Design a protein around this nucleic acid. Sequence first.
RNA 1: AAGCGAAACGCAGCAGACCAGGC
DNA 2: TAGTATGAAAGTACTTGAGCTTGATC
DNA 3: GATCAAGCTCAAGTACTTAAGTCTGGTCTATACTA
Length: 102
Amino acid sequence: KSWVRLKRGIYKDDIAQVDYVEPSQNTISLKMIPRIDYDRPPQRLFDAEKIRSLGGDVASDGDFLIFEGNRYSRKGFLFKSFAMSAVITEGVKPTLSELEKF
RNA sequence: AAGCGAAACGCAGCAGACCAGGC
DNA sequence: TAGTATGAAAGTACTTGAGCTTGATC
DNA sequence: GATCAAGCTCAAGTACTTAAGTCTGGTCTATACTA
Ligand SMILES: [Mg+2]
């Protein structure tokens, strides 16, 4: 239940909460705040209803949702697997605002 | 002197080059 | 992909090596 | 009587600045990386 930051992609230098750690040592499940415009980027809370209304590449499974290139989001935050080497697990130290967000 | 129906409402800048021209 | 990252200037003032006076020595 | 050394004087460099006044108009201005 540590915190990491992605290296590539738009989520670069963004705090992510390690939700589940896969024993395979290949990818780890991470909770991010989506930096998306909803197919219409500052961090903002996920709007499943908004993305459903906008349509496009979207799959609705209640609280779970898949959109825009297999991007997964459980509840209102992206819940996606990311490579072990694509994130930094040492020297993150999130602030109180980050703790409140996650 | 006269006399009629007696609520709420005046923006904003790059900057820095280089050229031509003016007395 | 999607985004971060890589040939027609001249002047003075100051420092340097060469030559030379007076010294301390011989 | 002579010498070499210290150090003062001179002509050869180097380091550094400065180069009229104001005004108008016009164009033009990064993309490599490497994931
Ligand atoms: Mg004139």
